[PDB]
Amino acid sequence: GPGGPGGEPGKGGAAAAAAAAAAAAAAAAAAAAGGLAAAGGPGQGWAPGPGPITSIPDSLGGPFASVLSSLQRPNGAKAALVKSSMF
């Protein structure tokens, strides 16, 4: 121990040994492969959205934006002009 008064010192390095085992496992995984070489790793789901923003707003509703466009002479009618015809 440290000297006398012990009790859950902390020193050891268990986390280190853990990570080691993980890496070691990988080695065995590869060694297992025999003859035909095939890794495999399809990238589906969790794809990048159209124009990702670092600080995207979390609003759920209308656009809420000021536009410099207005209605001057909008079209929309069902009628023809058959008056004052000169072939």
From Swiss-Prot:
Tissues expressing the protein: Expressed in neuroblastoma, brain and adrenal gland.
Domain of life: Eukaryota
Annotated spans, Disordered: 32-62
Ranges annotated as biased composition (Gly residues): 37-48
Cell compartments where the protein resides: Nucleus
Disease field: Central hypoventilation syndrome, congenital, 1: An autosomal dominant form of congenital central hypoventilation syndrome, a rare disorder characterized by abnormal control of respiration in the absence of neuromuscular or lung disease, or an identifiable brain stem lesion. A deficiency in autonomic control of respiration results in inadequate or negligible ventilatory and arousal responses to hypercapnia and hypoxemia.
Subunit structure: Interacts with TRIM11.
Family, similarity comment: Belongs to the paired homeobox family.
Protein name per Swiss-Prot or TrEMBL: Paired mesoderm homeobox protein 2B
Organism of this sequence: Homo sapiens
Full-sequence range covered: 228 to 314 of 314
